[PDB]
Design a protein around this ligand. Structure first.
Ligand SMILES: *[B]([O])([O])[C]([C][C]([C])[C])[N]C(=O)[C]([C]C1=[C][C]=[C][C]=[C]1)[N]C(=O)C1=[C]N=[C][C]=N1
Ligand SMILES: [Mg+2]
Ligand SMILES: [Mg+2]
Ligand SMILES: [Mg+2]
Lengths: 240, 244, 204, 211, 231, 233, 195, 222, 235
């Protein structure tokens, strides 16, 4: 079998293949995650270079791993499918062997472990993908939001963004998001998520996707018109 | 040892691109243009054969349009030999699904499977990727008529109208201009041929330089028919639309 | 215990003048218990017809397998498979399980689309081909069917006469078999039309 | 062997005998048929002693690793399932193990029956081994959810005594356990010889036997 | 230069540079001395610390009741090779009820190290070993190089500044070989030998490591206050 | 799992003051057929060990080749192969014992019973038994098959315990062994008159005696035995 | 285990399964639910050798749940039954086959039709208006053959099911400790808590 | 058909004192009705103040002891010459036995020594690896003859105090090493009389804080 | 290119030496051993204020009697921790006892050099393994990707290591109390950290014979930080 060590250290103590995988993430469309008091919202950018697209059948950016956990990403699209499939298999494997669904932290730890494994295994390259994993633990009303990256490190975030121009939207979130008082309602959480994407997106038409996840496996994706109403209200307040 | 001669086909560039995938896409940009257009009552697949000869046996020839099953077909752009490897795998996958569930495979599931195979060659194994881009035209009872494309990266997307191969930039602009949502198959047939006629590198668009196919519910009552056009039938539709 | 007689069932095929016929009972049982009266044992792949007797799980499995293989054949060959070619495919497929066989008694019937010649064939569970001119029998009442066919059959029967002959061969054989019956179907096959007839019979 | 376990108001009681035999020969008078997996988990033993000891001490390994990775104690449901999955791998290979996994977790008290076939049953009351039929008689006629810890301990004790008396392959002594939300509590070793006479006098039972 | 990228490549003068670079790792290692008489064999090792808070890296490893070694270079490679010796000594006992001859132990180490010098992908071992032992033919001392070369000697030293101790033993050859039935005097000669390789630092109580094996003496290692007697 | 085809019967042995004696007949039986009359079942290993083998002959020949290879292998890179690092009886036995137990553990045994007789470096007598099951034991006298039932009782009258070994001379020990071989010829239906005998002494070394015969047999009393009860003529 | 029954009426499928579990000569449990929800509109009851039953059921459940998540779509009862059949036909020629018989009751939301599939451990599949496994059919099929109509209501289906259980309770030597009854229709799966 | 198992007879006995432990066993080795050896040692000093005996099929017994002795050696190598405690040795032996769960070592095994508080310890094993600490255990051929006698004379079972008539038990007073050896010798003398596989010789290994001592006694040779 | 297991002309493995450079870029971790216990402390170093700092887990339990702190490519540590936990619990299964700290450390270090062309590269993380056993008492080990491990009275790893180690050189003595060690870790962490030390960006832990391994609460550490400030202002 092909055993070639592709991810290796350089004289300055860097693994370039892992670092170049982060550059692939930088190229990917922007993804954002914001957790309110009783919910988590996942926002995703859709680049409008591709029109004549069939939005019914085109792979959506946010993927359900189980009925209570979701996963969005930034980077190579094909790479993300492999992580999602593995995550979905592990979710059912956990339910089967332990009789409880996975915690959001556990699912994140698994996906992060897969990413790490691909940084010190022979004949393979790292995943060019960073993920945002969100949801609610079984019989728990505390929101969960985690981030992973090609190196395999993961951590919990009150709010986070990844992908192209993520530096700008993180700048926005850092000054707008208050920890002592997070978005109390679904409206406030979605509004803040749309606002953050409007710093980067371009047009607020079909370029913004929003997915709201609430406790007890209550997950819904907002439509174009519902999002368009947020886009309208934000700019009308801005004209002042 | 052997390491000396390894090109390392599955690595990132400093910019975060996959070298071999990008170069495979460069190869595909020189292949004959293939176009797919989805209508409310069917799908059209049109494709240009590359600089042919008068001594080529056209009626028994197939380089662009292939049948995966009774409901799904593909248009090819790139290395034909590479495409046939993948096509035969897809044909088997469709039959595996049918045997397991006793239902015809949903279009997206077949597309995802082939796209995952392409993805694998970019991440592990140390082999060159498949220099192929597909346009998938298919029907199932969930989403109805569907158009997809996949490329050597293993990434796939859905479309109302799309082109692959040569002059896609020019072709996509022309499609984006004249396409409408309430369009029908007969209109889509005309759009596909008109787009090829303007984007072609050849002097004139003739029957012997084309492969054509439709997927219609124009089959007697609630069912779908695949029509791979014969040379004489391509010649007739060229006259009908007013190109020759 | 005997896998070939757990579920029960029969199939018979006959040649006629420019036609063939293939027929089967509809019973599926668990030894003495009758489970289903709609278990058809005849399938078709294009214009080639295949009847299968024996263990029901293998009947279903082999149908799905030959559907799989004939669909690929057609995609590659760009034509429907012929009875002679399909017969060899059945034989090859059964012999590959020589030491772990499907417990079945397949029967092929059809008309070659090019030559127009009627064709029938029978197999044992492991692929041996019996290419008869007159008739083929299979199942738990095969002894009964042999006796009926060997006396009732005559060559060059017209389609509507052949129907009566094969129907009476099946019906009376099934009525002397505890594990066969519960309905019956007969296919009458001509070069470009096929008629399917369900027969009325005793339901015990 | 006779083992029993039952859920009640104030947790779960676990009681076992202590006899081990090789044919008619009583090879051990005092075997420990309960394993302390962790301060909140117990496992009973019936069948082959080697299989019971090996696979339930291996279960404790897996429950400890669960706690280290997750920082949280394993549920009774999850622990019982890990064990039943171990049995499913050696499915048909000839293992002989019948056990009850007793504990207290976030859902309150928990009790699962697991055997060598891979069977996994949740319930309020179970009994296993050669003398389980005798124990069930006493249990079924006296069990309530409204039992006190004192009365519940006695019921499980008295139920093992019933089996030890009649079943030739049950006896020796009774080991009692009481599982709470603050952990299991051992309630001693009780010789059946001494217990029988004590119960006969105080309770008036076993009139048929002369003392 | 162009021929040192891997172990599978000879240079134009017939040299194996990766093996030579592995040999270099031994020279960087701390000094260790070996010497023997006709009755006993002794190892003396100068242990090295990282700093004042750290412990002193152990240098001597027991392989069997009648055999053991001292290391200089990559310590993990010594653990791998000593583990192999333990297994081979143990295979000899379990199968043949026979204590493994020291000479045969050297032949086994040679062959194990050699395989790493001729194949692609692997690397040579980066450690040198001094094996002592007492078998049916008396006391023995061996020197192992990761090139594969194993040598039987009366006395020797490996590691940094080992040339000083090696010269001393070459002078003392006729004296220390005759130290029969006197373990303490043989150790003294070894401690005096390793002292010829010291600069700036001297032998302290947690610095010095000594091992001995002999006629009626199992392989035993002395550390801590057990070697204060010899300081 | 197999069955033995061509077989060898008893091997008998005992310790004496300065060494050990071992003996075995020269027959290779094929069931009740006394097929092969020139089979050597005592196999010397160096000048300090004799391995006596009973049971399946094809397996014996295999073991014979293993021992021959063991000598070859011991000499490799061994300057003291004919001195301090020569093969000992204890080494040879432990090797065979390892092989026998491994083969039984794979359910494919070497269908033999083996006695390793020899003298160690320090002059100590070595005498140990091993068989197809990997079972091992040592005793002042050892015998396989019929020898265990008939020879051991006779040999144990000479050396009944450990303290009788120094009191037993080589002449007395050989006399007992030779008598036992005669008794086995009277009573074992798979025995032969021809046998081999080996003595391993700490002073005089290995003495291997071939083509020995059972002699001084009592048969004359047979002439007086008539009928099975009442018959007089 | 012992008893599993199924009946397909006008607008629903009703599955009835016994509650008993026996080890040796002792009935360990009289409230066991011999069923698993494979999807919101598909229920599978099971009976066979100890251990294998639950193991197989949970394995099928995990596979269907995995499919549901991957495609964001519920497989038709027919598709699920074919998947199950293939797994059993695969299993019968394995080193150690899974000795499990199943009934699959589902409501097809596309066709708006209830569907009942009977599959034995060999992988023998049949679609039926009513079905059973083991000896259950020997006692009950004569009643079902007589009383069954395809236009029956759910309430009429339950009454005919009660008559079947009563006949079983009269003529079977084994005490199966009553049955748990579940209904599968357009609204999903629900349990009849009084039977 | 080849039978990989055999029976070599023999009997063993372990008794735990207050600050000592004894492991005894007869020296006779047999097959069927023949004697293989009158003196074939069966109880072994395994190092670290632990004694061991694997009674039953001698080939499996020798293999297990050999592997445990090996396990002690590697325990020293791997854990800085740490002394293997009797409880740790016992658990280790369980895993040695259970590795052959489906092709078992056909032996009843006993080990004896001192626990970590200096008190006498005996552990007893079945062929598949179930084990437990005990005060008293006889194993092997005559195990059923000896154990009841030890229940009576070591644990004072069914013995009460005169005058009370069954009300007060005989108190469980501790036994000296001289007292235990008397009970061991009488146990084997009695077993020799009624069991054909027991005889020839008796070898006792006594374990104290000072080390392992041996004692040998003659038994009847018939 | 060149082999992954290649020696340099100086006699060092290139990859091992390069992994050591990655560890120098890692956040600081300090360990101090005393006769009353071993203290482990780490710099969390959150990349952004929105990152919930309590999810940063750079101090980890291996067993009840063994703790572990990490520095460098922390993702690499997860499989090492998993192996350590398995080794610790497996030894308890085989020997009915706690495993020696040195033996646990040796087991972790055996993974280190299992790389080539096994894993494709060495680990890019260093570990401070602290614990207690009955034989050698309270112990602190430094486990490197070279496969080497040194025992230490006190040790610092990560970006501020050489500065911290010089400070530990002067401050450590054999009579340190547990409380004194706690403040000493906080003091040296505060010295080498970029951001100002508080209970949210720094974490403490310890291992004692009685209570075993414990990660300190943010409330408990906050008091020790306040106690540190006052005693530094006291002179
Ligand atoms: B009990 O009877 O199930 C008991 C439980 C075990 C944990 C000690 N088992 C045994 O007594 C079995 C025999 C048996 C008797 C009755 C039913 C089932 C099994 N004996 C042993 O496990 C055993 C093990 N080693 C030595 C002697 N006996
Ligand atoms: Mg009938
Ligand atoms: Mg009893
Ligand atoms: Mg006797």
């Amino acid at each position: 079998g092909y055993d070639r060590a592709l991810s290796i250290f350089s004289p300055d103590g860097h693994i370039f293949q892992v670092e170049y995988a982060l550059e692939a993430v930088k190229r990917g469309t922007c993804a954002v995650g914001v957790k309110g008091k009783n919910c988590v919202v996942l926002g995703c950018e859709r680049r409008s270079t591709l029109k004549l697209q069939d939005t019914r059948i085109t792979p959506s950016k946010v993927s359900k791993i189980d009925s209570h956990v979701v996963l969005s990403f930034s980077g190579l699209n094909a790479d993300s499918r492999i992580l999602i499939e593995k995550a979905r298999v592990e979710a059912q494997s956990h339910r089967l062997t332990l009789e409880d669904p996975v915690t959001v932290e556990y699912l994140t730890r698994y996906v992060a472990g897969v990413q790490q494994r691909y940084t010190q295994s022979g004949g393979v390259r790292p995943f060019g993908v960073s993920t945002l994993i969100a949801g609610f633990d079984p019989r728990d009303d505390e929101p969960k939001l985690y981030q992973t990256e090609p190196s395999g490190i993961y951590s919990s975030w009150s709010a986070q963004t990844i992908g192209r121009n993520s530096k700008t939207v993180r700048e926005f979130l850092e000054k707008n998001y208050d920890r002592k008082e997070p978005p109390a309602t679904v409206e406030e959480c979605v509004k803040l998520t749309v606002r953050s994407l409007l710093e980067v997106v371009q047009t607020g038409a079909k370029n913004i996707e929003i997915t709201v996840v609430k406790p007890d496996s209550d997950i819904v994706a907002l439509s174009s018109e519902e999002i368009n109403q947020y886009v309208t209200q934000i700019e009308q307040e801005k004209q002042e | 040892g052997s390491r000396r001669y390894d090109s390392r086909t599955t690595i990132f560039s400093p910019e975060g691109r996959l070298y071999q995938v990008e170069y495979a896409l460069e190869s595909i940009s020189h292949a004959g243009t293939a176009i797919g257009i989805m209508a409310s009552d069917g799908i059209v697949l049109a494709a240009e054969r590359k600089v042919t000869s008068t001594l080529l046996e056209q009626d028994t020839s197939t380089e662009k349009l292939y049948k995966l099953n009774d409901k799904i077909a593909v248009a090819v752009a790139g290395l034909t030999a590479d495409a046939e490897i993948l096509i035969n795998t897809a044909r088997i996958h469709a039959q595996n699904y049918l045997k397991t569930y006793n239902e015809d495979i949903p279009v997206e599931i077949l597309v995802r499977r082939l796209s995952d195979i392409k993805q694998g060659y970019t991440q592990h194994g140390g082999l060159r990727p498949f220099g192929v881009s597909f346009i998938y035209a298919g029907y199932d009872d969930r989403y109805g008529y569907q158009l997809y494309t996949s490329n050597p990266s293993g990434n796939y997307t859905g479309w109302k109208a799309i082109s692959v191969g040569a002059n896609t930039s020019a072709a996509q602009t022309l499609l984006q201009m004249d396409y409408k949502d309430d369009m029908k198959v007969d209109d889509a047939i005309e759009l596909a041929l008109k787009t090829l006629s303007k984007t072609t590198d050849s002097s004139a668009l003739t029957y012997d330089r084309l492969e054509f196919a439709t997927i219609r519910k124009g089959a007697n009552d609630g069912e779908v028919y695949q029509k791979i056009f014969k040379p004489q039938e391509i010649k007739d539709i060229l006259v009908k639309t007013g190109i020759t | 215990s005997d896998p070939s007689s757990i579920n029960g069932g029969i199939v018979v095929a006959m040649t006629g003048k420019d036609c063939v016929a293939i027929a089967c009972d509809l019973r599926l049982g668990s030894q003495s218990l009758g489970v289903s009266n709609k278990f058809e044992k005849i399938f078709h792949y294009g214009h080639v017809f295949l009847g299968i007797t024996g263990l029901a799980t293998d009947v279903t499995t082999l149908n799905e397998m030959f559907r799989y293989k004939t669909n690929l054949y057609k995609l590659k060959e760009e034509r429907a498979i012929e009875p002679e070619t399909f017969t060899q495919l059945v034989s090859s497929s059964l012999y590959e399980r020589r030491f772990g066989p499907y417990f079945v008694g397949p029967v092929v019937a059809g008309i070659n689309s090019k030559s127009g010649k009627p064709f029938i064939a029978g197999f044992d569970l492991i692929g041996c081909i019996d290419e008869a001119k007159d008739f083929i029998v299979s199942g738990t009442a095969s002894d009964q069917l042999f006796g009926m066919c060997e006396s009732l059959y005559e060559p060059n029967l017209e389609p509507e006469d052949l129907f009566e002959t094969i129907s009476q061969a099946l019906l009376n054989a099934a009525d002397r078999d505890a594990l066969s019956g519960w309905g019956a179907v007969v296919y009458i096959i001509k070069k470009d039309e096929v008629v399917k007839r369900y027969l009325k019979m005793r339901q015990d | 062997t006779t083992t029993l376990a039952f859920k009640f108001q104030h947790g779960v009681i676990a009681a076992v005998d202590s006899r081990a035999s090789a044919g008619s020969y009583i090879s051990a008078l005092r075997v420990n048929k309960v394993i302390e997996i962790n301060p909140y988990l117990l496992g009973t033993m019936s069948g082959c002693a080697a299989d019971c000891q090996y696979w339930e001490r291996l279960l404790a390994k897996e429950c400890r690793l669960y706690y280290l990775r997750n920082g949280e104690r394993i549920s009774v449901s999850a622990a019982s399932k890990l064990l039943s999955n171990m049995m499913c791998q050696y499915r048909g290979m000839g293992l002989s193990m019948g056990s009850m996994i007793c504990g207290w977790d976030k859902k309150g008290p928990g009790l699962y029956y697991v055997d060598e076939h891979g069977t996994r049953l949740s319930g309020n009351m179970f009994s296993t081994g050669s003398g389980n039929t005798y124990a069930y008689g006493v249990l079924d006629s006296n069990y309530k959810w409204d039992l006190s810890v004192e009365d519940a301990l006695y019921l499980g004790k008295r139920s093992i005594l019933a089996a030890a008396h009649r079943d030739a392959y049950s006896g020796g002594s009774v080991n009692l356990y009481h599982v709470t939300e603050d952990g299991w509590i051992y309630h001693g070793n009780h010789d059946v010889g001494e217990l029988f006479w004590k119960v006969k006098e105080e309770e008036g039972s076993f009139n048929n036997v002369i003392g | 230069n162009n021929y040192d990228g891997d172990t599978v490549t000879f240079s134009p003068t017939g040299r194996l540079f990766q093996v030579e670079y592995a040999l270099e790792a031994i020279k960087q290692g701390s000094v260790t001395v070996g010497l023997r008489s006709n009755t006993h064999a002794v190892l003396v090792a100068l242990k090295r610390n990282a700093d004042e808070l750290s412990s002193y890296q152990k240098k001597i490893i027991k392989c069997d009741e009648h055999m053991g070694l001292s290391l200089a270079g990559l310590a993990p490679d010594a653990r791998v090779l000593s583990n192999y010796l333990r297994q081979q000594c143990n295979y000899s006992s379990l199968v043949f009820n026979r204590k493994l001859a020291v000479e045969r132990a050297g032949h086994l180490l040679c062959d194990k190290a050699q395989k790493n010098t001729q194949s692609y992908g692997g690397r040579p071992y980066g450690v040198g070993l001094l094996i002592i032992g007492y078998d049916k033919s008396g006391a023995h001392l061996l020197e192992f190089q990761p090139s594969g070369n194993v040598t039987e000697l009366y006395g020797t030293a490996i590691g940094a500044r080992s040339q000083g101790a090696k010269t001393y033993l070459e002078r003392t050859l006729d004296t220390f070989i005759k130290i029969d039935g006197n373990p303490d005097e043989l150790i003294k000669a070894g401690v005096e030998a390793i002292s010829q390789s010291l600069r700036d630092e001297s032998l302290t109580v947690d610095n010095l490591s000594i091992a001995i094996v002999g006629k009626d003496t199992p392989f035993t290692i002395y550390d801590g206050e057990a070697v204060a007697k010899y300081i | 799992t197999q069955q033995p085809i061509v077989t060898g019967t008893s091997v008998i042995s005992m310790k004496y003051d300065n060494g050990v004696i071992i003996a075995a007949d020269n027959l290779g039986s094929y069931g009740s057929l006394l097929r092969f009359n020139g089979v050597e079942r005592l196999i010397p290993v160096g000048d300090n060990t004799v391995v006596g083998i009973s049971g399946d002959i094809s397996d014996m020949q295999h073991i014979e080749r293993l021992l021959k290879d063991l000598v070859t292998e011991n000499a490799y890179d061994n300057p003291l192969a004919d001195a301090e690092e020569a093969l000992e009886p204890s080494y040879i036995f432990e090797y065979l014992a390892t092989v026998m137990y491994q083969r039984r553990s794979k359910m494919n045994p070497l269908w033999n019973a083996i006695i390793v007789a020899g003298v160690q470096s320090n002059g100590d007598q070595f005498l140990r038994y091993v068989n197809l099951l990997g079972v091992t034991y040592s005793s002042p006298t050892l015998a396989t098959g019929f020898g265990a039932h008939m020879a051991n009782p006779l040999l144990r009258k000479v050396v009944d315990r450990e303290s009788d070994i120094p009191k037993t001379t080589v002449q007395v020990a050989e006399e007992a062994i030779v008598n036992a071989m005669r008794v086995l010829y009277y009573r074992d239906a798979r025995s032969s008159r021809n046998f081999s005998l080996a003595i391993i002494d700490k002073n005089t070394g290995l003495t291997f005696k071939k083509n020995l015969q059972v002699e001084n047999m009592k048969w004359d009393f047979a002439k007086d035995i008539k009928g099975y009860g009442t018959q007089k003529i | 285990m012992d008893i599993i029954l199924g009946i397909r009426v006008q607008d629903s499928v009703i599955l009835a399964s016994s509650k008993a579990v026996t080890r040796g000569i002792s009935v360990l449990k009289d409230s066991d639910d011999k069923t698993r929800q494979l999807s919101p509109h598909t229920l599978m009851s099971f009976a066979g050798e100890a251990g294998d039953t639950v193991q197989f059921a949970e394995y099928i459940q995990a596979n269907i749940q995995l499919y549901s998540i991957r495609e964001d779509y519920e497989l038709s009862p027919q598709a699920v039954s074919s998947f199950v059949r293939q797994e059993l036909a695969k299993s019968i020629r394995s080193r150690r086959p899974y000795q499990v018989n199943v009934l699959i009751g589902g409501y097809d939301k596309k066709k708006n039709k209830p569907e009942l599939y009977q599959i034995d451990y060999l992988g023998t599949k049949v679609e039926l208006p009513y079905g059973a496994h083991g000896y259950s059919g020997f006692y009950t099929f004569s009643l079902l053959d007589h009383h069954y109509r395809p236009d029956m209501t759910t309430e009429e289906g339950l009454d005919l099911l009660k008559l079947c259980v009563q006949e079983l309770e009269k003529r079977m030597p084994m005490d199966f400790k009553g049955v748990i009854v579940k209904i599968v229709d357009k609204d999903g799966i629900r349990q009849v808590d009084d039977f | 058909q080849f039978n990989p198992y055999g029976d070599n007879g023999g009997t063993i006995l372990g008794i735990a004192g207050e600050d000592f432990a004894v492991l005894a066993g007869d020296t006779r080795n047999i097959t069927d009705y023949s004697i293989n050896s009158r003196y074939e040692p069966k109880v072994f000093d395994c190092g670290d103040n632990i004694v061991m005996s694997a009674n039953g099929f001698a080939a499996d017994g020798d293999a297990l002891v050999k592997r445990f002795k090996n396990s002690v050696k590697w325990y020293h190598f791997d854990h800085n010459d740490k002394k293997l405690s009797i409880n740790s040795a016992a658990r280790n032996i369980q895993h040695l036995l259970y590795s052959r769960r489906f092709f078992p070592y056909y032996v009843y095994n006993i080990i004896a020594g001192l626990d970590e508080d200096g008190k006498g310890a005996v552990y007893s094993f079945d062929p598949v690896g179930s084990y437990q600490r005990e005060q008293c255990r006889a194993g092997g051929a005559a195990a059923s003859l000896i154990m009841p006698f030890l229940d009576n004379q070591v644990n004072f079972k069914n013995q009460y105090e005169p005058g009370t008539n069954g009300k007060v038990k005989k108190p469980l007073k501790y036994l000296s090493v001289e007292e235990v050896i008397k009970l061991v010798r009488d146990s084997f003398t009695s077993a020799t009389e009624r069991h054909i596989q027991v005889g020839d010789g008796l070898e006792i290994l006594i374990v104290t804080k000072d080390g392992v001592r041996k004692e040998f006694y003659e038994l009847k040779r018939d | 290119d060149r082999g992954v297991s290649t020696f340099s002309p100086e006699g060092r493995l290139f990859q091992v030496e390069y992994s050591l450079e990655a560890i120098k870029l890692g956040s600081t971790a300090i360990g101090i051993a005393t006769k009353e216990g071993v203290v482990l402390g780490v710099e969390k170093r959150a990349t952004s204020p929105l990152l919930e700092s309590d999810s940063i887990e750079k101090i980890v339990e291996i067993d009840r009697h063994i703790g572990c702190a990490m520095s460098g490519l922390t993702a690499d540590a997860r499989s090492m921790i998993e192996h350590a936990r398995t080794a610790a619990v497996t030894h308890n299964l085989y020997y009915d006892e706690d495993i020696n700290v040195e033996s646990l450390t040796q087991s972790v270090c055996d993974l280190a050099l299992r790389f080539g062309e096994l894993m494709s590269r060495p680990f890019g993380v260093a570990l401070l393994i602290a614990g207690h056993d009955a034989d050698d008492g309270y112990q602190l080990f430094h486990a490197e990707p070279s496969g080497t491990f040194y025992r230490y009275n006190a040790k610092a790893i990560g970006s501020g290591s050489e500065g911290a180690q010089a400070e530990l050189l002067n401050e450590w003595h054999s009579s340190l109390t547990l409380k004194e060690a706690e403040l000493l870790v906080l003091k040296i962490l505060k010295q080498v950290m970029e951001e100002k030390l508080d209970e949210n960006n720094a974490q403490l832990s310890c291992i004692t014979k009685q209570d075993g391994f414990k990660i300190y609460d943010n409330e408990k550490t906050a008091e020790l930080i306040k106690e540190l400030k006052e005693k530094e202002a006291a002179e």
